[PDB]
Design a protein around this ligand. Sequence first.
Ligand SMILES: OC[C@H]1O[C@@H](n2c[nH+]c3cncnc32)[C@H](O)[C@@H]1O
Ligand SMILES: [Zn+2]
Length: 349
Amino acid sequence: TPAFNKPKVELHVHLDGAIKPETILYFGKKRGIALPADTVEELRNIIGMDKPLSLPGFLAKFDYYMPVIAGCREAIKRIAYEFVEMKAKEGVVYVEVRYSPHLLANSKVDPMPWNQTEGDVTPDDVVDLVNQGLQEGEQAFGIKVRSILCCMRHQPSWSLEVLELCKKYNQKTVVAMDLAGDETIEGSSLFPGHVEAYEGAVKNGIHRTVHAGEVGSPEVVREAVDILKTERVGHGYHTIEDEALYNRLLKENMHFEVCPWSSYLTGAWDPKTTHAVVRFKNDKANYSLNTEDPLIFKSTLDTDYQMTKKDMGFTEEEFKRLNINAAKSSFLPEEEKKELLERLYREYQ
Ligand SMILES: OC[C@H]1O[C@@H](n2c[nH+]c3cncnc32)[C@H](O)[C@@H]1O
Ligand SMILES: [Zn+2]
């Protein structure tokens, strides 16, 4: 009994956080790289989370498997193809997948991630590989998929290259630029490289989204909106703490990419207090429901819908509403955006 057994739109999920324990296990053995466990079940209990951690603590779960995928063309392409398949099964008709091309390369990246040995999988090459896997999956499962390239908060030197990658692969799946990573790194939103990459995104027409306000204060969101110029805000739960900012973003119709389950598990939400999404629902705010990192939260898109249904009392009326806003707020060109909307209204009939 799915909470919302109808077509959905997902705007917030990381490719490297949506991998199958099985594929992780396959390449661990195939490359002879160690994993913390040798059974999908135990691998899933080590990588996955049962209780709230902190943002930096949760972020460490990637250390376990990223080395197994990074540097391998076959793996990079495969996880891209299998991602589409996963989303197809969840009943998602349009998705924007995000990831850091740098954390998957093993050549022309400094610092070299995961202590890898120089290879030939360049940051540009990883973008192309994901594109190919994404496209093959679209043909095979029939859903539309697009990508977003992430800037890492702690590594602003990578930022201008991410911008260049967005320019090159513009619409070749690539639709936007994101700022992901450790939100707690004081002043990370303001590092020159990040600011300059975003200034360039604005002048070159490249779409923008920024993780902000999951753990930081209203000010981090204010910097994302005012200085960085995001078109959307990843999370943004703390925005409501500044009635002025909240009400202003509400007026401009700012889109908040909400991830309920994630907010609880990253410690970002005290289950005693009313979840920010409730305020958004009541205020009729522009927001979407997202999974964020399904692998680590041992979850599915339905996890998040069920959660808002059971607690927070969401209805099908709201599920349809927020999905229309997600389609209106997607980074799809106008014509593709109309087609998506047409599709949903038909199926919501
Ligand atoms: O998907 C690109 C990167 O975004 C970071 N990321 C994943 N989930 C996140 C939640 N919040 C902030 N950053 C996150 C990860 O370090 C992953 O390597
Ligand atoms: Zn995220």
